[PDB]
Structures are given as C-alpha cells and as structure tokens.
Symmetry: C3
Subunit: 358 residues, 3 copies
C-alpha cells in the first residue's frame, strides 16, 4: 500500500530493544506521500506491555493523548513539583504533558496491556525523541552523556559510585522489564471513559462514543477529539464526513472495510482493515466503513483539529439533505419532492445499519 490514507500494521516501525513487550512507531504521514502535509506534526505510537511489567520512566519532545485499547495499567507522570497517578481502564483517555517524566505499570498477571498514543512534537515538526533517566544495555541514560566532572559536582557524590549506578542499569535488557507482583501493587482532571460520554449514539448494529475538547480541558492542549466506534458484524457505519477534524483511526479488534470519496474528479479510496491497521480521514471526505460478516469491527479515532467539529451524515434519519427546504431539494436533485423522499427517508436508523435491508 500504495493507499495514500491507509497504513498497514506490518509497516509500523518496531522499536528494536523493546524487551518484555513492544513499542511500535508509525512513520511520518509525509514519508511516502504529500497528501497528508496538513498533519505533518503528528505521530502515532503503540505501546504493548506484558503482564506484570514496568515501563521505565522517560519524557519526550511531545504532547500526548493516550487511549487504553487493551488490558489495564497504572500511569504515573511527574512534572516540576507535581506528581499525578491514575488507574487506567479499557477505553480510558488521559493526557501526558510534554516533558513530563512518565512510567507505566501492568499490575495484571494475565491480560497484556496495549496503549495507543497520538503525539504532538514541540520542537521540529513531526520529530520527537524519548529521554531516559535510567537506561538499559540498549538504551542510554541521558545522565551518562555528561562529563564525570559535571555529575560528581552536581549530585555531590563520589565518582566511583556513579559508575556503579550506571552499571546497575546495563544489567537489564529493554525499556520494558519484568517485575514482582508485590512492588507493582504498592505503586497504586482524571481519565476519560469513552463509553461514558454524553455524545453517543447506539443501535442494534453499532455503538459510537466521542469525547470533545470543549468539555475536557486535557484535550484542549492538542486540540483533539477522541472517539470510539464498534460496528457489529455484517453491519456498516453510514456514509458521513467531518466538517473540520482530520481523524486518525486505529483498528483495535476485528476485520472490515472502508470506502472513501477522495478528490485528490473523484476517486474511491478503499482498503481492507485488520487489527493494528491505521487509516486517515481528512476533513470533508465522505467515508463509509463496513464490518466483516463474522466478527465485529472496533475502532478508536483521534480527531486532529477537533474543536467545533461537525459530523454530517448523508444517510439515515439524521442525514443533512433532510434539512434542505423542499424547493432546495427539488432544484438540487432535479426531481419531485416525493421521489426524493424515496431516497432519503426510507432508512429508519442512523449511524449504523445492516448490509441487508429491512
């Protein structure tokens, strides 16, 4: 692919070194194509940590919006003089400020943890780096970069012990390490529950939840909306488009398909969806997504430029055509009022519909 808006999961760059888990990096949106220049300063990172693990502390040149797509975790980050710690749930959304030192705990013994993060670099556009205070055989501590003279004077500690301190770190391999279930238990505004949002619509064929920045202060920094959609098997999300937001969508679970009308006159942009896949819906593009016939398709999405965004549906009871006056409809479609009704007033549900008519 060879699809300008579609990113297959095996195209993700896997961090070397990962250890007891894996960290994957999505490439730059402007790497293979120029059609995504509008969001060049956005990167996607997927973190997965094994049961009973500890993610080493670090900070990065980027703001972050985090979605827990699998399992649970305890997330803690420090900044200046404040420390904040939260127990994160499935579908929980949390913000981690740029420069804040962050570490993660997987306190569960059975279910593997997965986190999907949208990053907004503060330095060079679309470029970020991770800074580790304590490293491994394969991750250098940024403290070890300084000359010995600086460190012994700054910390007021003898030279011999500092190199003991650094050798203790070149013992472990990976920024994700195995840990006791006993220490991890001790280490335990707030998280945003997607399936608890007021902005939602659900029927027999799917459910939709969305957290908009206007109601959540922590989403106002990156100016981003975060939404969740489950399309039941054999169903679809009806054709619609976003007025303003450019949505980056991650396939959490299942398989399916999407069709997009792209004028970059028009052309049908389409791709097969599977777990780990990522695709982008630039604003204005009308989009339709179908689940598979045998399993549900579950998606989480990040809405870049999400303030005051409006989702306009082209089919269903809430469709926009239905807001035109009768004369406007007739003039636009070159048909009488009743033959227009036969097209835009025969669907009784919204958002999600079955591929087999009823």
């Amino acid at each position: 692919r060879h699809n300008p808006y579609y990113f297959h999961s095996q195209g993700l760059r896997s961090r070397h070194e990962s250890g007891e888990g894996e960290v994957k990096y999505l490439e730059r949106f402007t790497e293979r194509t120029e059609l995504l220049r509008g969001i060049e300063n956005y990167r996607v990172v997927i973190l997965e940590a094994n049961p009973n693990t500890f993610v080493l502390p670090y900070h990065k040149d980027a703001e972050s919006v985090i979605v827990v797509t699998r399992g649970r975790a305890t997330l803690t980050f420090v900044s200046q003089e404040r420390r904040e710690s939260f127990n994160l749930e499935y579908g929980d959304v949390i913000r981690v400020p740029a420069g804040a030192t962050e570490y993660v705990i997987n306190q569960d013994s059975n279910e593997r943890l997965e986190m999907v993060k949208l990053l907004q670099p503060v330095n060079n556009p679309g470029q970020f780096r991770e800074y580790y205070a304590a490293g491994a055989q394969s991750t250098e501590s940024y403290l070890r970069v300084f000359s010995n003279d600086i460190l012994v004077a700054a910390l007021n500690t003898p030279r011999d012990r500092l190199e003991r301190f650094f050798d203790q770190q070149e013992q472990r391999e990976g920024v994700i390490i195995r840990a006791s279930q006993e220490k991890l238990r001790a280490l335990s505004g707030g998280p945003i529950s997607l399936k608890s949002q007021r902005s939602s619509y659900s029927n027999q064929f799917g459910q939709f939840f969305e957290a908009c920045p206007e109601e959540h202060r922590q989403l106002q920094e990156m100016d981003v909306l975060v939404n969740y959609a489950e399309i039941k098997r054999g169903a679809m999300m009806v054709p619609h488009y976003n007025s303003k937001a450019t949505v980056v969508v991650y396939v959490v679970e299942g398989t399916g398909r999407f069709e997009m009308a792209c004028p970059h006159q028009f052309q049908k942009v389409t791709a097969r969806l599977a777990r780990g896949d990522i695709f982008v819906i630039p604003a204005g593009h009308p989009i339709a997504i179908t689940a598979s016939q045998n399993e549900n398709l579950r998606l989480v999405g990040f809405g870049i430029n999400g303030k005051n965004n409006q989702r306009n549906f082209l089919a269903g009871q809430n469709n926009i055509i239905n807001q035109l006056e009768r004369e406007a409809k007739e003039l636009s479609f070159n048909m009488p009022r009743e033959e227009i009704e036969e097209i835009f007033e025969r669907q009784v549900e919204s958002y999600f519909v079955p591929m087999e008519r009823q």
Copy 2:
C-alpha cells in the same frame, strides 16, 4: 513582473459554471516566494446570472464572503441546523467549513457577485468542492461509493439510485436557471458601510469590520474593509502594522504604489481594473490613486487582522506628528518650522485630491 499584483485575466475559471461563473485565484506561492506568509489562503469569485440557483456543496475550508454586486439569499446546513440569510451589497458573512452551502439570486435583473476568502483546513492552500448533486462535468460524491453500500445505507433499491443519478447529468453547470416562483419560496450578516470604524470626506469613503467586534471573523482571524476612492483622488500613503491585506477591485480603474524592500527599496506598481487582485504585506507603505474619470471601489481582506493598526504617513492623523519637536528635529536634521512645512499642510485624512489646494 509584479509579485504582488494578480490581474483578473490570470484567474482560472471553473469548467461548466452554467448560468454564471466561478473563478479561482492561483495560490499565492505559485509564481513567487514573496507571499509564503499567506500560503494557506485562496480567493474565489462567484458570479451568478439573474434568476439562478447555485447547487449545494461543502468544502474543506473556512470562508468569509463579501457581496460586491446585487442581492442573494445564502443558506447552509450543518448536522441538524440550517441557517439562511438575505444578503445585500456590502454584506459580509462567514460560512463554516463542512457546511453544505447553496446560493439564490432571486433578483430578475441584477447579476450577483460574491468575493470569498478561503482558509483550507487540510493541506495548506489546498481545497476541494464536494457536490452531493452534480452535473454533466461535476460528479456527485455519493456516486463514488459502491452500490451495495448506497442501497443498504439509504434503504433504497438499485433501480431508483441509478435514476437518481441520471437526473443530475441532465443539467450542465453547478449554477442553474430556476423559476422565480420557486426562488421566492426559499426566503448574522455584517454590513460594512454601517461599521463604527469608518471615515468619509469628499474624496473617498472607508469602512472596516474588525474581528474584535465581530465573532464570525475571529475564526479565520480576518478583518474585512471597503474603500471607495473618488476619481482624481487618492488614499494617502499608509501601512498596516501586522495585517496582510488582500484587495479586490470591485469597480473602476486606478493605480497603486507600494514601497517594497524585497526581491534597498523599490517601487512596485501596477494599473488596476475590475477583477484585479493585489496583496499588501504588513509594514509595506501603500498608496492608491483613482482614475480621473471614474471612482475606484475596493474590497479588502485583512489576514492576521486581530489587533491590527493602520498607520498613516500623511494627513491630519499621520503618525509623524506624534513625535515631540526634539525627536523630529533629530531624525530629520531640520528645524521645527521646516518640518511642520512637510507634515502639517494636509488638512484632510485618508483621502486627498491629486490636485492640491
């Protein structure tokens, strides 16, 4: 050879506009690098014959609209809300991005003209028009989907969809003729020439809408202003502190002179006619003269217009008489009386005649 002057004959016209015309200004960064600062801005001119209907569409761009001729009823829908407005000459209004918009000219005689400043929401300086219902050379975006998706979503047989679409490639053009009986049935805005920020004398008139006072202008962060320069007169040399002004010649002829220090100073100048567009980057001192035979009417978009201040270099209000006596003497190497003689002999402001009195 002028990097800031866009002659009307350079505008690209849309194919099969029908009962009217839609013209597109090139991207400001296409022929030159000197306008990189306003890369994400496009100018579109809509023009509709009497008794016409502009087909509904939306675009991936915010819009500020100025009616420069005639009357119109503008309607746009978004989600479940519809807003409709009766727009006259000099009315200024915003159409939100993603909103499905259509325009009506219910006037039986006056041709409609709309001048639009667009601010793309996707890729910088790039926008597209999405038509729900199209024509022979404009495709409906609904027809792009596979049939199985359309029949399932709309709950409508394949047979009716195939005919829904053919009824659209019967008309040619995104602007169509309509009956005034149906046009009449289909019946906030900012009036420029009612603004508190205005100045008027016998040599010209000026009106300006600032984003600080109008909320719909703060989305694009733009000021909208209008200037009519009476024939034989001129708008005195002045400059904008921060705003880069895009000017459209609505009517008349004339000329502009601007002091440009880019690729020390140099006189950039061009003669103006209707449909012409020229750009005034912030800091540039600019002077505009009407012709001897007709007034010059201009409409301007002030990009980055919040907290902007227009500084005049000549006239009653010129910035130089804000200096104390000692500063002017020190700066100009001249006594107080030889200086007053230069910067205190113009009794009017904004607009002056080319023959002094």
Copy 3:
C-alpha cells in the same frame, strides 16, 4: 564550529551603516541546519549604541521583545494615535508591537548601551525588514520611493521642499548618530527581571525569569525571558525544559555548556564567550559551567514559553525524588538507601560549585 545549536559571535552579520554604534543580525536558525526548523520564524537582533546617541526611527514587519543587557536607555514608539515612552534600566524587558515606529536614546555619558532583541516576523516565516521614515547616506527613506505626484498631493507640499527634506538625510552617515546630552535629557510598562517572583539565588549564582502567564506583553510572542549569572568556578546543574526552546545570549564572561542531544544520544558541547548564542530545544538536558577566572552571565528567550516547566536533575528541587520509592528502585535497580546516596546529597539548587 560543528555545533548545530551553537552560533559564535563572529558569525553575526553586522549592518554596515551602523554609525555611532552597531547593529548585528543573527542568521536564520534554519540556514546552516535543519535541526532548528521548529523555531524557523524567530530572529535575533543585537543593538549597541555609543554614549550620547540617537537611534533613528523605524518600524519592522515583526514583533519584538527587548532586553537591556548593558547600561540605560529611553525607548519610545508610536502607533496609530498612541505614543509610548519608557526609561529602561539594566535587566529591563519590554515589548515593541509590530508596525510601531521606534527610536532609542542613550543619554548616558560613558556607558555604552546594548540591547538584545528576539523578533517574530508577521509576514514570511523568519523574514523581516526595517522601514525607515528618515534614512541615511546608505539607507533609503521609504517615502522617497513614491512618485512626486503622490507625496506633493498627499502632504500638500511643493517638490523642492521634499527634495531638500531628503538631502538633509543624505548628509548623515549611519542610522545611529551623535546628539547633545541636554536635548536627549529633554526627551525624558517595562519588566524588571531582578524583581520577578520567579527567582532563585545562592552563593554560586542567581536566576531570574519572567513568564508570559504573569506578564501580558509577553503573551503576544508567547515567550518567557530569563537571566542567569553563574559565578566563576561554579555551574548551573543539569536540567531540561518541558516545552520551551530557549535562545541564550552571553552577556559577559566565558564558560562552557554540555547538552545531551539524541539528534542514540551524543554530547553536544561548545566554549562560550561574549556575544555567543546557543539554542536549547525542549527536552534537551543542559548543563552550563562558568569559567575559572570570570563569571558567566546569560540572557535567554523561551520560545513557546507558556506553561513551561524547568526540571532539574540535581539538587534539592530534583525531579527524580518526585518518583515513588518502588519506582526509583525498579527504575535504577538499586535499594532505596543507595539511591538516596546519589539524588539527595546535593543541598543547594540551580547552581553548584565545580571542583
């Protein structure tokens, strides 16, 4: 000097027709390297004026935040219908709005004035121009560009008196000129850095910082401005900024800085002297040492400075002792007592002595 974040003073471009002083321009941060693309639209200007001088009025297509790094001055600028005038002291910080016509007075008899300016262009990214109403032998007045028709009509003044107006300016050499001390006296708000609530000082150095949250005039460029004096033989402990990218100017002295740069890490370092400028992108941990023989005095502009947080890696205000006990132990693979040993035995903050 092979350092992508370091700009030696001898690289500054000086305006030729400076006159009774000098004006230096830092190159665009994106000229030699791609590593500072994020601050593309920022320029540094250093103004130096001799005693008893008058800086001729001009405006520019750029916002500016000014810091007085030497001496005293009277700054005045006009815009639309307003006139604004201020007496500036050493360490004073002030904003000059874009498009405002400004001129500067040094009415001091022997201490030369120095001003360091950070500019934020309003037009093309990282590009600005200076517009002089009245010029000099090698500097055009922008009025002289217009046709004679326009000026005589606009100003209502005969041509001969315009053409003598311009000649009176083509006699002076330089845009900074000599002026009587008594007339400069006739020609007579700012943020005082050393009076900010956000400050820390010990025996080895002092630090002052003015953040945009507390001063409205810094919110236009969205920048924090700070000052640090590291006394000889001492150093400012390793630390990093959460989001602000700081442009630092060496006011006086010599020294050195070490920076951990992952652009997998590597040690970026350079010797500092007066006039030198170096950049600290967000996230980068930075350590600065004064010289053995003289103090090191620095001025810094924090681009994207709102809600910035300075995190120290050594001292009592250290960021690591905010981690939980089990977190530190797991993170450092050591018992709590051997960890205390390293991150709790420095008793001061910000500044500590070397050897």
